[PDB]
Structure formats: C-alpha cells, structure tokens
Write a protein that binds this ligand. Structure first.
Ligand code: K5V
Ligand code: K5V
Ligand code: CL
Ligand code: CL
Ligand code: CL
Ligand code: CL
Ligand code: CL
Ligand code: NA
Ligand code: NA
Length: 129
C-alpha cells in the first residue's frame, strides 16, 4: 500500500505513535517518507546482507526473521514479511520496541539525517487528526 501523508499520519496516531517515547507524530511521518516513500512493500538489501522491510524499513539483523540473515536475531518476534502488510500494526508495534531500545529514533538513519532538527510538524499540517 502506498499511503498518503495525512492518511499515514492518521493511521500512526490510531496506532499510538503520537508522542510515543516523546516523539511527536510528524517525526514518524517524516521518517516513513524518507525510509520507504510511504510504501508498505518497500524492501532493501543492506551491505551486511540483512534487509530492511516496510514503511519504516525495519532490519532483519535484529528485529525480524527473514530466514536469510545468518547470525541475526528476531527481537520483534515476527516474520519480516509481516512488516509489508497494508495494515501497519506489525510495523508500529515493532517500531515501538526499536525506539525504546536506548537510541530513540536515531535507530533510523534517515530520521537522524533528514528529520531530526527540522520542522517535523510540517508533515502533519493540514491533516484531520
Ligand atoms: N551465533 C548466532 C547468533 C545469532 C543467531 C544464530 O543462529 C547464531
Ligand atoms: N537542538 C535541536 C533542535 C530541534 C530538534 C532537536 O532534536 C534538537
Ligand atoms: Cl508527501
Ligand atoms: Cl535468518
Ligand atoms: Cl493501517
Ligand atoms: Cl529518546
Ligand atoms: Cl509533529
Ligand atoms: Na516536539
Ligand atoms: Na533476523
């Protein structure tokens, strides 16, 4: 599914991301935009052989099982394919674990490089929430 901006903001709010661990909604929308272009089916192989999955590009080295990342863990205890659904529940639930792991949203390199320090509220302007 390719979400619209506001459509995603609303879905993320319904799933509890707004101000989760202190991160306002626009942080999550901005991160999704630059991670996946708002596409739940995005997959991208990393240099270490892991793959990133879904709207928040969650990585198989640590977070999910894809059966092809030797020596990895599955800390969200989910198949990586769950993270590609049109329903964002699994991605949101795993993102909550990731952002609680000690480095906050810095776990998403794109957030750190593209959203942190910027006016992220822009990403939810205009939306019915
Ligand atoms: N050593 C190790 C670490 C994680 C996963 C596995 O299958 C092996
Ligand atoms: N100093 C500064 C300004 C905006 C956001 C942030 O994370 C830090
Ligand atoms: Cl957009
Ligand atoms: Cl694996
Ligand atoms: Cl959804
Ligand atoms: Cl934090
Ligand atoms: Cl915001
Ligand atoms: Na804020
Ligand atoms: Na894994």
């Amino acid at each position: 599914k390719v979400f619209g901006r506001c459509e995603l903001a609303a879905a993320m709010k319904r799933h509890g991301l707004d101000n989760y661990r202190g991160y306002s909604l626009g942080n999550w929308v901005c991160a999704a935009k630059f991670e996946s272009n708002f596409n739940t089916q995005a997959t991208n192989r990393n240099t270490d052989g892991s793959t990133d999955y879904g709207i928040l590009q969650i990585n198989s080295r640590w977070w999910c099982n894809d059966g092809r990342t030797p020596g990895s863990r599955n800390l969200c205890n989910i198949p990586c394919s769950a993270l590609l659904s049109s329903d964002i529940t699994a991605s949101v639930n795993c993102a909550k674990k990731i952002v609680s792991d000690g480095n906050g949203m810095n776990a998403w390199v794109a957030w750190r490089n593209r959203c942190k320090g910027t006016d992220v509220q822009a990403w939810i302007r205009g939306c019915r929430l």
